[PDB]
């Protein structure tokens, strides 16, 4: 949401009954952001934006990694954090978790009628997330350095309490 | 160090039999060798504590020894594994060894698998 | 040493700033610069007139279902709208800060001709001739969608 | 809204350690106990008592003890000097396989240790995976930055005590510059 | 000046599958303290502003032959210059040069307070071998200069706090000396 | 001078029998000859002294003489490598000679290799 995320994507989720097969979206997150992954969905009926409010339809988005399994994968359905209830602007902040599960991830939207069981669902898409030299590169040095900083804090704390 | 073999079988109506898994232990591996078994079933894995049962392996040594009710130490929450730390007295023999595993609670005894291996006599 | 298929070729209408696209399934592509120099004789010698140069490029390509661009071209030749095109050679990046964009030639003009063709039991092929309308500029340009 | 991080690696804490604070952890890789060694893997544990202000901080950090690797158990004997603090001791365990994967599994939990031994081995235990080089700073970064800000607070108090007399220096120089006129 | 500060690479902070790119930057082995990488960050199409106050930026660096028995890898901070324009530079270290060949790099930022970070390109890079060599730094080096400098600066800040607390006793003498010198200067003129 | 033969000894649970090594010392090679070996279990080398490990070499001659728990040197500073110098005793016996590289921790024995080599005048 802040002025630091990627937020350079405009997805045209159009509620068209005709056809909406799939979006092989051209988008990445590099698996190490883990603090700011923003998806700016739009909403349209035929060619115009929708007007959805909180009292009106509630929002939902389902994310599901490629190889989902009860033993391995990922799957969650959360909210959208509406931005503009006039032009249909939906900024969704991706969780800190999925960006650890490298690879591809499919997604979908979902709209629930506020006050009735009626719902609506939009077109799919797939926002790949690549690997990064940040999320790899070693399996010891991280533990060595966390141990070193722990020793340093535990030590300097003695002198600190002494002088305080 | 320690020699270990990570094997997994599954109960089957057809009956199972594993053809001498390639683990040729040595008689001198007194208290290091072992076996790690993981049972599988229709859903993917078994949990003993859930429906409390006990496994037991009986193995027929080379023509002059037979052991039953072996230690077969259970494992933790991993729900299915067993690290059968092989003791000394067993490997004191050598040749074509073959064992068979069963599961029992009371009146429900089921033979899960009958596999084999070999031990080399290195004086 | 350059395989022809390395040459990438893009078009777009001047008005549609956002719009971008590429030509697909080229079979033969050919650029041309034609100098009109006809010397008129002189008693004391001869002088070589410097005339205009009508550069043009002709390409043939195929026509499939998931594209209508060729239809936009056969529209422009008739409506005589302006276009501008990019003859970018891939595998040739910038030098300092322009690596993502590869060398290219940019020129704005009209499509002077469209001619498609069919053949029983075969894919239909459309050819186009584009007049460049002046000097062709050089520099580097960036591709869309990394392809 | 379920999760299934694809490392299939976990470090569980035995509830059957209620006696003498013998922290007996277990490892599970691909639903399998991992055979470890002194060289093939690495371990670490940190413990801090309840929210002592600064005075009585059971802030300890030590490695593990391999009780049974082939079975996958790791023992840690609680120091007698530590368990004297009957306050709820929060704990952070860290295990690392070094199997060409940047997996550093962290386990955050706590209990109600009593002055005699571990008591009330409860608390909602959570686990995380340090799979990026920024939270190695953030793993212990909480108490690290806490002590850093405490040092900065002492520093600004000292700076105010010094400015109390720097202002006197300013008054002196200005009164003298006015008197010379 | 004499240094290889002519190069410059742009880092697009956008989520549109910015692929790896061969920046065509080939330093040499016998180059110490003069191999510099000029990064210029861009948010969507124009430069992204930056600062060492709000955010803190680092870069990861890894050779291509990286193994457990032989390789190279580091992660260290940057040197922001002309921040408003989204520009900065990284002075290549000295121990890393000894390892030649291809290299991959990366630049990641961390916003203070929230620790929510950002990763830009994962771009490529080259390093060549020269004739001034013979010493082999086969030993793989992996040091997180970020946290290392963190602990070193914490220790230095503790020591400086100690020195300042020691000087606190000298401030009264400073006041007295300043007042005496002022009185002397008055009595002089 | 020295004539050293480097070898790799691996603890592979699927049996371990390193056959005829190309190495072939000679009788009069009293002390110059020497075997050098490096243990590698699963992830590379293993530091013996790290956790109370003790190696052992028990070699059987092709004929008669049979020795047990031979001496050796451990360059522990580097890693759990072994350097066995034959003390003018084994080499004197010609013909091939096979070995058995035992490794015992307290109460835990292991047999991890069976290598041999030929010897002639």
Short mmCIF file of N, CA, C and O in Angstrom, two decimals, chain B residues 75-118:
data_model
loop_
_atom_site.label_atom_id
_atom_site.label_comp_id
_atom_site.label_asym_id
_atom_site.label_seq_id
_atom_site.Cartn_x
_atom_site.Cartn_y
_atom_site.Cartn_z
N UNK B 75 9.26 -44.81 17.17
CA UNK B 75 9.69 -43.46 16.86
C UNK B 75 8.71 -42.45 17.46
O UNK B 75 7.76 -42.81 18.16
N UNK B 76 8.97 -41.18 17.18
CA UNK B 76 8.20 -40.07 17.72
C UNK B 76 7.03 -39.73 16.81
O UNK B 76 6.62 -40.54 15.97
N UNK B 77 6.49 -38.52 16.98
CA UNK B 77 5.28 -38.05 16.31
C UNK B 77 5.32 -38.28 14.80
O UNK B 77 4.30 -38.14 14.12
N UNK B 78 6.49 -38.60 14.25
CA UNK B 78 6.65 -38.84 12.82
C UNK B 78 5.58 -39.78 12.28
O UNK B 78 5.31 -39.80 11.07
N UNK B 79 4.96 -40.58 13.16
CA UNK B 79 3.78 -41.38 12.82
C UNK B 79 4.07 -42.36 11.69
O UNK B 79 3.58 -42.24 10.56
N UNK B 80 4.90 -43.35 12.01
CA UNK B 80 5.06 -44.49 11.13
C UNK B 80 6.45 -45.07 11.07
O UNK B 80 6.63 -46.21 10.64
N UNK B 81 7.45 -44.31 11.52
CA UNK B 81 8.81 -44.78 11.38
C UNK B 81 9.24 -45.58 12.60
O UNK B 81 8.68 -45.46 13.69
N UNK B 82 10.23 -46.44 12.39
CA UNK B 82 10.82 -47.26 13.44
C UNK B 82 12.29 -47.45 13.12
O UNK B 82 12.65 -47.93 12.03
N UNK B 83 13.15 -47.05 14.05
CA UNK B 83 14.60 -47.14 13.90
C UNK B 83 15.06 -48.37 14.68
O UNK B 83 15.48 -48.27 15.83
N UNK B 84 14.99 -49.53 14.03
CA UNK B 84 15.35 -50.79 14.68
C UNK B 84 16.87 -50.86 14.80
O UNK B 84 17.57 -51.43 13.97
N UNK B 85 17.38 -50.24 15.86
CA UNK B 85 18.81 -50.31 16.14
C UNK B 85 19.23 -51.76 16.28
O UNK B 85 18.82 -52.45 17.22
N UNK B 86 20.03 -52.24 15.34
CA UNK B 86 20.40 -53.66 15.33
C UNK B 86 21.43 -53.90 16.43
O UNK B 86 22.42 -53.15 16.52
N UNK B 87 21.23 -54.89 17.31
CA UNK B 87 22.18 -55.10 18.41
C UNK B 87 23.38 -55.92 17.99
O UNK B 87 23.55 -56.26 16.82
N UNK B 88 24.23 -56.26 18.96
CA UNK B 88 25.46 -57.00 18.67
C UNK B 88 25.15 -58.47 18.40
O UNK B 88 25.49 -59.00 17.34
N UNK B 89 24.51 -59.14 19.36
CA UNK B 89 24.30 -60.58 19.28
C UNK B 89 23.76 -61.01 17.93
O UNK B 89 24.05 -62.12 17.47
N UNK B 90 22.97 -60.16 17.27
CA UNK B 90 22.35 -60.54 16.01
C UNK B 90 23.40 -60.70 14.92
O UNK B 90 23.56 -61.77 14.33
N UNK B 91 24.14 -59.63 14.65
CA UNK B 91 25.08 -59.59 13.53
C UNK B 91 26.26 -60.51 13.78
O UNK B 91 27.12 -60.68 12.90
N UNK B 92 26.34 -61.11 14.97
CA UNK B 92 27.38 -62.10 15.22
C UNK B 92 27.33 -63.24 14.21
O UNK B 92 28.35 -63.91 13.99
N UNK B 93 26.17 -63.48 13.60
CA UNK B 93 26.05 -64.43 12.52
C UNK B 93 26.27 -63.72 11.18
O UNK B 93 26.47 -62.50 11.12
N UNK B 94 26.24 -64.49 10.10
CA UNK B 94 26.39 -63.93 8.77
C UNK B 94 25.68 -64.83 7.77
O UNK B 94 25.19 -65.91 8.11
N UNK B 95 25.62 -64.36 6.53
CA UNK B 95 24.97 -65.11 5.47
C UNK B 95 23.69 -64.46 4.99
O UNK B 95 23.55 -63.23 5.04
N UNK B 96 22.75 -65.27 4.52
CA UNK B 96 21.48 -64.78 4.00
C UNK B 96 20.49 -64.65 5.14
O UNK B 96 19.96 -65.66 5.63
N UNK B 97 20.23 -63.42 5.57
CA UNK B 97 19.28 -63.14 6.64
C UNK B 97 17.97 -62.69 6.01
O UNK B 97 17.95 -62.01 4.98
N UNK B 98 16.87 -63.07 6.65
CA UNK B 98 15.54 -62.70 6.17
C UNK B 98 14.62 -62.52 7.36
O UNK B 98 14.54 -63.39 8.23
N UNK B 99 13.92 -61.39 7.39
CA UNK B 99 13.01 -61.05 8.47
C UNK B 99 11.62 -60.77 7.92
O UNK B 99 11.41 -60.61 6.72
N UNK B 100 10.66 -60.72 8.84
CA UNK B 100 9.26 -60.50 8.49
C UNK B 100 8.60 -59.73 9.62
O UNK B 100 8.79 -60.05 10.79
N UNK B 101 7.83 -58.71 9.25
CA UNK B 101 7.25 -57.77 10.20
C UNK B 101 5.75 -58.00 10.33
O UNK B 101 5.07 -58.29 9.35
N UNK B 102 5.24 -57.85 11.56
CA UNK B 102 3.83 -58.01 11.84
C UNK B 102 3.35 -56.87 12.72
O UNK B 102 4.14 -56.23 13.42
N UNK B 103 2.05 -56.62 12.67
CA UNK B 103 1.39 -55.62 13.49
C UNK B 103 0.29 -56.30 14.29
O UNK B 103 -0.49 -57.08 13.72
N UNK B 104 0.22 -56.01 15.59
CA UNK B 104 -0.74 -56.66 16.47
C UNK B 104 -1.23 -55.68 17.52
O UNK B 104 -0.44 -54.89 18.05
N UNK B 105 -2.53 -55.72 17.81
CA UNK B 105 -3.06 -55.10 19.02
C UNK B 105 -3.65 -56.14 19.96
O UNK B 105 -3.15 -56.32 21.08
N UNK B 106 -4.70 -56.84 19.54
CA UNK B 106 -5.17 -58.05 20.20
C UNK B 106 -6.17 -58.74 19.29
O UNK B 106 -7.24 -58.19 19.03
N UNK B 107 -5.84 -59.94 18.82
CA UNK B 107 -6.70 -60.72 17.93
C UNK B 107 -6.66 -60.22 16.48
O UNK B 107 -7.23 -60.86 15.60
N UNK B 108 -5.98 -59.10 16.23
CA UNK B 108 -5.78 -58.61 14.86
C UNK B 108 -4.28 -58.56 14.60
O UNK B 108 -3.62 -57.55 14.82
N UNK B 109 -3.75 -59.68 14.10
CA UNK B 109 -2.35 -59.79 13.71
C UNK B 109 -2.28 -59.79 12.19
O UNK B 109 -2.96 -60.57 11.53
N UNK B 110 -1.44 -58.91 11.64
CA UNK B 110 -1.32 -58.75 10.19
C UNK B 110 0.16 -58.72 9.83
O UNK B 110 0.91 -57.90 10.36
N UNK B 111 0.56 -59.61 8.93
CA UNK B 111 1.94 -59.64 8.44
C UNK B 111 2.08 -58.60 7.34
O UNK B 111 1.49 -58.73 6.26
N UNK B 112 2.87 -57.56 7.60
CA UNK B 112 2.96 -56.44 6.66
C UNK B 112 3.91 -56.76 5.52
O UNK B 112 3.58 -56.57 4.35
N UNK B 113 5.11 -57.24 5.84
CA UNK B 113 6.12 -57.46 4.82
C UNK B 113 7.08 -58.55 5.25
O UNK B 113 7.18 -58.89 6.44
N UNK B 114 7.79 -59.10 4.27
CA UNK B 114 8.80 -60.14 4.49
C UNK B 114 9.96 -59.84 3.54
O UNK B 114 9.96 -60.28 2.39
N UNK B 115 10.94 -59.09 4.03
CA UNK B 115 12.10 -58.71 3.24
C UNK B 115 13.34 -59.38 3.82
O UNK B 115 13.28 -60.11 4.82
N UNK B 116 14.48 -59.14 3.18
CA UNK B 116 15.71 -59.83 3.53
C UNK B 116 16.90 -58.92 3.25
O UNK B 116 16.76 -57.83 2.68
N UNK B 117 18.07 -59.38 3.66
CA UNK B 117 19.34 -58.71 3.42
C UNK B 117 20.45 -59.71 3.73
O UNK B 117 20.18 -60.90 3.95
N UNK B 118 21.69 -59.25 3.74
CA UNK B 118 22.83 -60.11 3.99
C UNK B 118 23.82 -59.41 4.91
O UNK B 118 23.85 -58.18 5.00
#
